[PDB]
Amino acid sequence: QSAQAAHQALVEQLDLHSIHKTFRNPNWRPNQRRNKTIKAILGESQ
DNA sequence: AGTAATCCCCTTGGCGGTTAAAACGCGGGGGACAGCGCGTACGTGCGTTTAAGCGGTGCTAGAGCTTGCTACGACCAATTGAGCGGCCTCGGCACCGGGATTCTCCA
């Protein structure tokens, strides 16, 4: 149905995953557990 | 027939002591609890199919109610012995002591 095809076409148009970010450094990778909470970050004050 | 003194009994309260149980101090250990990483196991979403739910049809078991009477328990009076209150004693269980065996912990 055309409505569902247009919906997927819009979602494809909105998608960032289809986009290569030429400005990104391909080498650098984070520590995957960098997402500490404020509670945990304040726990580094000690 | 009533109300108060008299007398039994059994519960509450106090005093003394004695000693066994509660309170207090202190070192350390190890168990509570916060922190981290992972990974697997539970919540989510989709397509599938399965049968629970509804509207409808058919039957007969058996729940529920009445009738009729006689077998079985309620009630009473006379009989008696099984079961309770009181007294006795001796033997089971505790309590102690002492030597023997076990278990625990640091080496």
Q: Residue A4 class from Cβ within 10 Å (0-12 exposed, 13-18 middle, 19+ buried)?
A: exposed
Indicate the resolution in Å. Answer: 2.7
Distance, in Å, from the CA atom of A3 to the CA atom of A8, rounded to the nearest integer, reads 9
Closest nucleotide over all strands to A40 (CA to C1'): B35
Beta carbons within 8 Å of A12's beta carbon, 6+ residues apart: A18
**Nucleotides, chain B, CB distance < 7 Å:** 35-37
Going along A1-46, which residue ranges are E strands? none
CB-CB contact of A34 with A40 (8 Å): no
DSSP tag of A26: S
The single-letter code of the amino acid at A13 is Q
